[PDB]
Amino acid sequence: PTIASITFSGNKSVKDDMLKQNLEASGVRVGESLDRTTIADIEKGLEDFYYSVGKYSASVKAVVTPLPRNRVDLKLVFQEGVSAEIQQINIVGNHAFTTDELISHFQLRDEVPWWNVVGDRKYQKQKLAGDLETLRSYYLDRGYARFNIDSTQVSLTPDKKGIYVTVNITEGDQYKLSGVEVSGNLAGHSAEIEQLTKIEPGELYNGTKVTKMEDDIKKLLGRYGYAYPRVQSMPEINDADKTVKLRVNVDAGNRFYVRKIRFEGNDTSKDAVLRREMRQMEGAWLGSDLVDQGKERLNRLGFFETVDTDTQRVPGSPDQVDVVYKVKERNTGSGSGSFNFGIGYGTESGVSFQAGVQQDNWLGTGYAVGINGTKNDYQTYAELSVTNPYFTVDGVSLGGRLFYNDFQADDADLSDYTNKSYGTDVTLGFPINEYNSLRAGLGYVHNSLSNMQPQVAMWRYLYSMGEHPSTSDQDNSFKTDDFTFNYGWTYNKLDRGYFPTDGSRVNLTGKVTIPGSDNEYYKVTLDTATYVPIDDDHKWVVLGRTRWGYGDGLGGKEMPFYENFYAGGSSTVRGFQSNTIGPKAVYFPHQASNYDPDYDYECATQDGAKDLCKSDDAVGGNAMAVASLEFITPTPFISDKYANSVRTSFFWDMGTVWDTNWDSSQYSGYPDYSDPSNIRMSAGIALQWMSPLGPLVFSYAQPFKKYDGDKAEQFQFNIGKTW
Amino acid sequence: CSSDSRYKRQVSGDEAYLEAAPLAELHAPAGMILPVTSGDYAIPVTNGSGAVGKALDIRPPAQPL
Amino acid sequence: LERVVYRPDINQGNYLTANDVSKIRVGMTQQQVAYALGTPLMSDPFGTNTWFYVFRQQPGHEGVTQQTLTLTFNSSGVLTNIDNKPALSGN
Amino acid sequence: SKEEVPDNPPNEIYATAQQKLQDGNWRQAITQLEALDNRYPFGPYSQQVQLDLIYAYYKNADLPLAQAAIDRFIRLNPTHPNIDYVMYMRGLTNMALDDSALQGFFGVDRSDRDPQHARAAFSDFSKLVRGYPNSQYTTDATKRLVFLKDRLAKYEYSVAEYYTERGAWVAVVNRVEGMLRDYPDTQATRDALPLMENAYRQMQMNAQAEKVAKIIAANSSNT
Amino acid sequence: FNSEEDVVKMSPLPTVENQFTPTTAWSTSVGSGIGNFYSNLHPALADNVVYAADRAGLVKALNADDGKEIWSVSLAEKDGWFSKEPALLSGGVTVSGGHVYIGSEKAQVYALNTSDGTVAWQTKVAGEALSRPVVSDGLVLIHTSNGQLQALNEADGAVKWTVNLDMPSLSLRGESAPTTAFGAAVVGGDNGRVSAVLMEQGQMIWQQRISQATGSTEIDRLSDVDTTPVVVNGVVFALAYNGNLTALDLRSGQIMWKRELGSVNDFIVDGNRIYLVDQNDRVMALTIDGGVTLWTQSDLLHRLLTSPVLYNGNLVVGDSEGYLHWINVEDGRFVAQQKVDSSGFQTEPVAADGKLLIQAKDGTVYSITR
């Protein structure tokens, strides 16, 4: 009868598809004609795989079950023999080291502590065959060149539940490296080679460093050509003096030339976008470092998952190569569906029309055109962003935007104000070197400030502008037209666009209003982020994102208050609502309009208020500093679709916001916002998740050094909003 | 999942290909030779039988069962 | 202006040295030419078998410079001409 | 199971699949045909079942699995006369990979984002046409092949332009010579030729510029 | 339930109450013992003194009648501040001529004087010595885990000769101990063979295969032989895991009879029959005539057992649950059952100087008498 189905059950601890692959590799596939005696042999084969997966006492029940006419269903059930556990690892021949010093370099473990469940000790016949290479390396790394594995033995208990590992080795001796000598054709790069081969005479031999010598010799010759050089570090042995002489033959092949540079897997992103970032040219000799710089600059564009490379030798030619970069795009919405699915959520700018149109690639002229929507509680914002990051392929970017936003304040947890504002930003990007670029540009901005509830700071501002309004009521307004010069210096060694692991970003964005503007002032922002890894897998990373802010007017005039820095929020200081950090609203007592008792018209004389009053609402300030120091971590137990790595972190948010123009001497009955002191601290954990329909972030924290009147709150998040 | 009578032919798109210019028979004078053509990108010439596009079927044939 | 802003170094064509170029002699043959200089990144597609080697560099947006070495063989593959022309005045 | 009726004779299941195809309900047809394929790795309708499965994957736009299934079918069956249709489907699949929804809406050129799918489709359609030039689908295939040659030519033109604006003049020479060694016969490459002349000027290659100058002068109208 | 259990191997405790109860004399906690660690590190007895050892390096000499300590020593390295100190003694104790011989998985093999516990000599050997050591011709005969097979000068431990055997890459965690007679040392190997060696020089006298090659894996196509070969009247009896239970000639190893269905553990000879246990823990009695069954029992079956011994007419085995069970020689029946321990038993018991000796997993010696 035909196998109409194979029914599987009882593989508690064994991966499911391996069973099907075993059966089909052994014959008697689905649909095949079953000889009924052969079910015993099929059972035996399944058990033999249960040998392969380390369950040497397993057994299987295979009930062949009739089905209509020529059909059967084979109902397998698997008796899960206990997984073979390593009881111990033992080594024979030691005098230099105890077992632990060796086992610490294994993946395999002998013991799992009573105080924590560290990685666990199930055996695999092909785990040890790899792990022993680490022991062999270790003795060679410690310079025991004459080391050898005498033999490898692994053994089982008579009841076949337990594994015992036996390692027989010869220690030899930790011979000294006497020197290094290269031979063969070095293509005249000998002087550099000598500096690669720099060692200290009489030191212990070091196998790992010899391997590094081979690799870095390869890489050096890569920096001149030579995609395929041979390196032969087979050394001379001097048993009499107890030393080893590192002869290294080297084979500098050719000045390989890059016939082609393809991009593969690239879709929905035009060739010009990627190829421009290359540094290895077509029709030129290979510099492998240049290809790797290409790998980085592609990785840095934020367009991809896992950019990958190849250096195929051309068929039929000895000395030309293809260079091929494989890429998978980040599915950041721009390719399919409808434009960026512009629905989002949050409490920061608010629940948001977070929308984006991108890569309209207008009329083929070589500019991207787009529109970004940001309608929420916090602002009524939208923009027409036109940009080419390489307007001039020499490297100069050009772009700009008009934008309108009637900024809404107490909806943003600030003092009551509203400001019908707009402006146009025009900027160029001057790249400076291999890694650094310099933003510069001009811009006109308009403001129509209104709904000004009386509170000291703006009245410092309006006073400095000659406006001395009464503190009577909120129905006061002001407007300005200002021309601005804006710039940003930007170091970037970030290893990858989303979720960095190494290098750093600096962003020293500063701008100033030029003479002829209504208000003369400048503001300077130093955004910064440094990533340093602690694991070679680059899943554990020390990240410091840091910020500083400062500004002043011409001749001591006040800067526009709404240009104050702000802090709080998931981005800047986690664990405090939106912008609550720093100086608060301090109203004058006033005749509040549209009075009703259901309204918290704070400091209103309507309620009987008499004098200047404090509240938790923020106003921000000209001066700021922030330091979020945090340990990025691998995600917990969820790594099945691991390549699109979701990220998690442990963090500690330091920061402060204040006003150097705050006149404490005039208002000593109220907080001393004149001083940077009272630096906040908050700590917590965060989650960042890559949905294709708009990535997400979550954060929860304890404000460990809270201060007066802060709107502290333990949790924040967003939806559909990468930034 | 439900499709009308001519969703059965469209390709997630339509025959933007069919409205295209013919091949250019590039020629050069004496002294010139246009470099030898790779057969990897030759296109044979045929009698033009049958319809094209969605006017031509892609429903799989049926062999003697 | 170009000089205002960065560019990466742009290399083109074959690497060359006075040592290796000197290895090309009249009467040389193509495979031995390949052993001397490697395959040229260019060859005349329009008829006569002449190979072009170009050591051309445009560092730091200053002084694009090259040696252009033109080689010609008869159709049987034996070299008939050499022209190691240096660069014209650049900008 | 995937909404499988416990069983039916292949006559009835295959007719029900025909109904789902007429219904255009690709998903349920896919489940039924998967069931038949696993039921009948050989059998009276096996080859036909895989043919319908190819058509079904394709119309459900599950293209990668479609290509894999077509590869499996042609691996199993080199002899069947109808293989010409299978070749056409393999080519049409690699064709169908060349689209993106917002690009299809906006109409900006698909030309120069990925050549890989295009090369595979070109290869397989070319094998169809040169191997079975008497087949029904050949004429549509040759029209598609002109479109694909134009596709590849435009991709290479774009590479030529961005190497040009960077100044990789040797590279542009090589790439334009490539647009002549391969597919010399498109408007795209006829439009690409001036790049060679300019590049030769940027390399002081006067005589070679003379050679190419012959071509461009002679071809703005046919000679 | 993501964790693991397989109770299939849980034959029930016997219904037979003790027909008679041998005297459960005395016990002694000798250090750590082995805990989990499988090995045949059983104590030994001579001249009415018990000599006992511990994997953690501890050793004692005891008055055999009540376990009163005579002297004790620890062979481990002493420091152990930051972490443990692996000593790992191995192999069953054996004694002759005022010296006690002990192996270790640190590959050191020792000679200890019975007088005061002085280390007469200690010497490295070509592998972990899991062997029960044997003395002949002034030699200590030592097989090794590494597949080497050694004779050591009994006075100072220097190697007298070396021998090699073919080796699988996967085997039992065990070691066939040698037997010495007729000028030949005789021992088995996991290549599926038993070999005889001339004790004068280490010369290869003969080797005989007893394989039962099966299945697919090294575990199946090659068979382990970690039992001990037994000599009676000039016929050599041998056993292997699923291998050929056999009777063999002392000369040229040619088979006198073959019986198959082998096992891992020791087999006890008495008169015209042999008593032993299956790898499935079934127990059997077999004639020297072709290995024919005198009796076999399903009453003991697959559930962890010790090695057998014969003692005062009892075939004796122990359990992981710490029971001792006696079985009668002439016919198939339990004689008695006794919970001696709670940690359980893994080694062979020893019958010596009229006593019955046993070692628990946790290091507790126990002794039984009539």
UniProtKB/Swiss-Prot annotation, chain A:
Record bears the keyword Signal: yes
Extracellular side: 347-348, 376-378, 409-417, 449-476, 514-521, 553-621, 659-680, 703-716
UniProt keyword terms in alphabetical order: Cell adhesion, Cell outer membrane, Membrane, Repeat, Signal, Transmembrane, Transmembrane beta strand
Outcome reported for the amino acid change (mutating G497C): No effect. Lethal
Effect on the protein of changing E282K: Lethal, wild-type protein levels
Disruption phenotype: Deletion is lethal. Depletion results in the accumulation of incorrectly assembled outer membrane proteins, including TolC, OmpF, OmpC and OmpA. Decreased expression leads to decreased susceptibility to contact-dependent growth inhibition (CDI), and decreased expression of outer membrane proteins (including in this study LamB) as well as up-regulation of periplasmic protease DegP.
Outcome of substituting E713L: Very minor growth defect. Lethal
Residue ranges constituting the POTRA domain according to the UniProt record: 1-81, 84-172, 175-253, 256-330
One example of a Gene Ontology biological process annotation: cell adhesion
Keyword presence, Cytoplasm: no
Effect upon mutating G342P: Lethal, wild-type protein levels
Disulfide bonds: none
Periplasmic compartment segments: 1-337, 360-367, 389-396, 420-435, 491-503, 533-541, 632-645, 691
Major localisation: membrane
Outcome after substituting D413L: Very minor growth defect
Subunit text: Part of the Bam complex, which is composed of the outer membrane protein BamA, and four lipoproteins BamB, BamC, BamD and BamE. BamA interacts directly with BamB and the BamCDE subcomplex. The Bam complex has the shape of a hat, with the BamA beta-barrel crown in the outer membrane and the periplasmic brim formed by the BamA POTRA domains and the 4 lipoproteins.
Protein name in the entry: Outer membrane protein assembly factor BamA
The encoding gene: bamA
From Swiss-Prot, chain C:
This protein's UniProt keywords: Cell outer membrane, Lipoprotein, Membrane, Palmitate, Signal
GO annotations of cellular component type: Bam protein complex; membrane
Phenotypic consequence of gene deletion: Mutants show minor defects in the assembly of outer membrane proteins.
Membrane topology: Lipid-anchor
A single GO molecular function term of this UniProt record: protein-macromolecule adaptor activity
Keyword Lipoprotein (UniProt): yes
Entry's Gene Ontology BP terms: Gram-negative-bacterium-type cell outer membrane assembly; protein insertion into membrane; response to antibiotic
Disulphide-bridged cysteine pairs: none
Keyword Protease: no
Compartments it resides in: Cell outer membrane
Subunit structure and binding partners: Part of the Bam complex, which is composed of the outer membrane protein BamA, and four lipoproteins BamB, BamC, BamD and BamE. Forms a subcomplex with BamC and BamD. Monomer in the periplasm, but is able to adopt a dimeric conformation in the cytoplasm. The Bam complex has the shape of a hat, with the BamA beta-barrel crown in the outer membrane and the periplasmic brim formed by the BamA POTRA domains and the 4 lipoproteins. The intact Bam complex can have 2 BamE subunits.
Family as reported in the entry's similarity comment: Belongs to the BamE family.
Name the UniProt record assigns to this protein: Outer membrane protein assembly factor BamE
Protein's organism: Escherichia coli (strain K12)
Lineage, uppermost ranks: Bacteria, Pseudomonadati, Pseudomonadota, Gammaproteobacteria, Enterobacterales
Residues of the full protein shown: 23 to 113 of 113
Curated annotation (Swiss-Prot), chain D:
Membrane topology: Lipid-anchor
A Pfam family assignment: YfiO
Similarity annotation: Belongs to the BamD family.
Cell cycle recorded as keyword: no
GO cellular component entries: Bam protein complex; cell outer membrane; membrane
Keywords: Cell outer membrane, Lipoprotein, Membrane, Palmitate, Signal
Subcellular location as annotated: Cell outer membrane
Quaternary organization: Part of the Bam complex, which is composed of the outer membrane protein BamA, and four lipoproteins BamB, BamC, BamD and BamE. Forms a subcomplex with BamC and BamE. Interacts directly with BamA. The Bam complex has the shape of a hat, with the BamA beta-barrel crown in the outer membrane and the periplasmic brim formed by the BamA POTRA domains and the 4 lipoproteins.
Record's function text: Part of the outer membrane protein assembly complex (Bam), which is involved in assembly and insertion of beta-barrel proteins into the outer membrane. Constitutes, with BamA, the core component of the assembly machinery. Probably involved in transient protein interactions. Efficient substrate folding and insertion into the outer membrane requires all 5 subunits.
Alphabetized InterPro entries for the sequence: BamD, BamD-like, TPR-like_helical_dom_sf
GO BP field: Gram-negative-bacterium-type cell outer membrane assembly; protein insertion into membrane
SUPFAM superfamilies (alphabetical): TPR-like (SSF48452)
Record note on disruption phenotype: Depletion decreases the density of outer membrane proteins, but does not significantly affect transport of lipopolysaccharides to the outer membrane.
Main subcellular localisation: membrane
Swiss-Prot record, chain E:
Main localisation: membrane
InterPro entries: BamB, PQQ_b-propeller_rpt, PQQ_rpt_dom, Quinoprotein_ADH-like_sf, WD40/YVTN_repeat-like_dom_sf
UniProt keyword annotations, A-Z: Cell outer membrane, Lipoprotein, Membrane, Palmitate, Signal
GO molecular-function terms, A-Z: identical protein binding
Entry's family note: Belongs to the BamB family.
Quaternary structure annotation from Swiss-Prot or TrEMBL: Part of the Bam complex, which is composed of the outer membrane protein BamA, and four lipoproteins BamB, BamC, BamD and BamE. Monomer. Interacts directly with BamA. The Bam complex has the shape of a hat, with the BamA beta-barrel crown in the outer membrane and the periplasmic brim formed by the BamA POTRA domains and the 4 lipoproteins.
Protein name, entry field: Outer membrane protein assembly factor BamB
Organism: Escherichia coli (strain K12)
